[PDB]
From Swiss-Prot, chain B:
MF term (GO), any: 3-oxoacyl-[acyl-carrier-protein] synthase activity
Family label: Belongs to the thiolase-like superfamily. Beta-ketoacyl-ACP synthases family.
Name of the protein described by the UniProt record: 3-oxoacyl-[acyl-carrier-protein] synthase 2
Catalytic site: C167 (for beta-ketoacyl synthase activity), H306 (for beta-ketoacyl synthase activity), H343 (for beta-ketoacyl synthase activity)
Length: 415, 416
């Protein structure tokens, strides 16, 4: 018995990010080096050492659905549904009864409905268990983003949700890519979503000192900079439509590019500390390269994990050098987190969009805020300004707590 | 040039913690003897909830399996996953050396992860302030920490993931790990589901949803397919299996319980909690798994059903079996082990995959206990009360979850 190996193309993009309430706004702001970082308004910033966050700007859920529908969705689900409908509309895909069992959904979330859980548990403690919402359980579960997307779209195919901390979006896309490659779906609506700007998330990330305590939004998120002191938390959703090539061509779909490689490894080291020298991340990049059937020298641009944390940025630099050798100083590396902040489970989704758009548009987005170069972080980070360049291959990296490492490789579409 | 043959995937090890026993042998032997793991709730004070019964682990002490130093930073869901995964690897007699470590992966899911940790830590936040929240709060709570902690405990450096799909969690995680090995991305996968849902918010949440049985009698509370079924009885635990590429298993002289041959996944695209009318989505997922296995539906001998003891789910699952199997539906055996273990949520698929694999190896079908009033709408052969000795070639395991997830696995008797 032999494996089916279908070609998988990107036919639609949808997004909500601190840089815009659609792909066009997000992409244009990213290539112009616009920061989505400002003072915290979502929660009371006085209680936490962290004073800045990357929030959605002027997002009103009622512009997309009824108040009654929105009331039964946590922010993480609202973002996923809005971005998925945006991606399908962009793909110009008509999900009929005929194709519905061949159209699936694979969207992840790092934590799901944390705000709902906090509000509902606070109701339990002060008002008693009978006052708990009949919809608390489905609203909270991370897989409800996939569930609500499938209902909104009429998508009846492969239906799943990957939860792998900050590697969530990258793994979800990789998993959906594998579904199409083996012929188990013709279309997959995939990516990540996150609404982590909550009391427990700010308390939790302050307790483990992962968050930047820099009160200046102009210098808070500075990946690879000598003075980096933790990440700046963001929110949103990045959803893409993956499609089997012949299916896309037959319907006259527009093609942004092709997904060719996916790598997944575990550090098997520590619950929160990444492996020394980023060895696991190096292995995940190598698996994705082997999956794509290319030489490492073929990678033109790396959309780095680059969170603006001491260890991660240093280890990611080391991992790139291990994988690419002499080609490491020849490629371009950039972290869009310098502008969007860290979207956690949605990071991989938004960064896959930027990686795909980098190939289609031939523009590398920059890493902003690098003022003090770090001798340990000496690669080409495309500082301050976007670079116009024809790209053939783009690599996107992610990692998460529990030692998860995930890598995706995108390729310029050629017939 | 690239490789293209599908690898054959065998089950080489089993590990479990369930309300029926703190290992596979105890759980299996109690299940085949129709022993109930359901009793009054002791985990939380149940006086405020309408639900009065649960299926808890019996005399489980995490310190019998690991040092206190290791257990302290683990929520119960992670403790269960680590203990069951170590048991599965020990049973598989697998030596994870530095050489094979990048070829040994982990794919374990949890429906909710560290809910108890989240509740305790949020209660600390409200009464003591955010500066008193633990630096271990975030990693302890996240559902993927079961995979994370299992990989650290084992030294497993390969494909590392976590599927979260409500009650379909365990089934999807196993199916996903099976696909990893089939495409040649790992030689070994430690996979399954884990859950510790016996918490304040879980009892309150499922009571508010009216998903839980409010029957105070532990003797009749969980009764799948019975006319008087009135919601599920919550359980806890972990079911972990070692999946392995066939040639790798044969070369090391591994014992083989059976083979994984089929996996189906669909979405109802209907409602947040209610399953589709006539269980159409579940019927499609069974059909996808059957096609994946390359068999005729008549080849299925036994169905380990989702059978949660809820009105719509048991009725719709019965309808879905009739749609898929036709005239063969009344010829096959169907049973719900949830009648004994209760509903393990994210761990249900893991424990039920173990029972399905053991059903083939031992040639014994576990029964559905507590069926006293037959429902005219649920008229299939549910193997009532007593286990059935039968040679099985193919076993199908079904799962479904909130959000319209449907997941199916097919296991086969191993033949060279
Ligand atoms: C992420 O892995 C951080 C990193 N190393 O880049 C991470 O911790 C995300 C975990 C998901 C968190 C959602 C919020 C929880 C309170
Ligand atoms: C499960 O899907 C119910 C079913 N239809 O069988 C389910 O609700 C589990 C989702 C929750 C998992 C753990 C959450 C506890 C609060
Ligand atoms: Cl934990
Ligand atoms: Na997570
Ligand atoms: Na065991
Ligand atoms: Na529990």
């Amino acid at each position: 018995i032999q494996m089916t190996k279908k070609r998988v193309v990107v036919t639609g993009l949808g997004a909500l990010s601190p840089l815009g309430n659609d792909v066009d706004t997000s992409w244009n702001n990213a290539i112009n080096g616009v920061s989505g970082i400002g003072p915290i308004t979502r929660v009371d910033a006085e209680e936490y050492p962290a004073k800045v966050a990357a929030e959605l700007k002027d997002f009103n859920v009622e512009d997309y659905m009824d108040k009654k529908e929105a009331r039964k969705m946590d922010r993480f689900t609202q973002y996923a549904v809005v971005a998925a409908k945006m991606a399908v509309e962009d793909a110009d895909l008509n999900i009929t009864d005929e194709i519905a069992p061949r159209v699936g959904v694979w969207v992840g979330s790092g934590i799901g409905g944390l705000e709902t859980l906090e509000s509902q548990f606070e109701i339990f403690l002060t008002k008693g268990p009978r006052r708990v919402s009949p919809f608390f359980v489905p609203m909270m579960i991370p897989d409800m983003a996939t569930g609500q997307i499938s209902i909104a779209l009429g998508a009846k195919g492969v239906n799943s949700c990957t939860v792998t901390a900050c590697a969530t979006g990258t793994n979800s896309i990789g998993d959906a890519f594998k579904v199409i490659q083996r012929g188990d779906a013709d279309v997959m609506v995939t990516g990540g979503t996150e609404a982590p700007l909550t009391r427990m998330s700010f308390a939790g990330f302050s307790a483990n000192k992962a968050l930047s305590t820099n009160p200046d939004p102009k210098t808070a998120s500075r990946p690879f900079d000598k003075n980096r002191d933790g990440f700046v938390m963001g929110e949103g959703a990045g959803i893409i439509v993956l499609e089997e090539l012949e299916h896309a061509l037959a319907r006259g779909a527009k093609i942004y590019g092709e997904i060719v490689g996916y790598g997944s490894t575990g550090d098997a080291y520590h619950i929160t500390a990444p492996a020394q020298d980023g060895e696991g991340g190096a292995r995940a990049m190598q698996e994705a390269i082997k999956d794509a059937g290319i030489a490492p020298e073929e990678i033109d641009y790396i959309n780095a994990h680059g969170t603006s944390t001491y260890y991660n940025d240093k280890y990611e630099t080391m991992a790139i050098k291990t994988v690419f050798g002499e080609h490491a100083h020849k490629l371009a590396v950039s972290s869009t987190k310098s502008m969007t902040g860290h979207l956690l489970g949605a990071a991989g989704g938004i960064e896959a969009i930027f990686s795909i758009l980098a190939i289609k548009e031939g523009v590398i987005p920059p890493t902003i805020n690098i003022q003090t170069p770090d001798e340990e972080c000496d690669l080409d980070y495309v500082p301050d300004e976007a670079r116009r360049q024809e790209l053939n291959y783009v690599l996107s990296n992610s990692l998460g707590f529990g030692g998860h490492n995930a890598t995706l490789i995108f390729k310029k579409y050629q017939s």
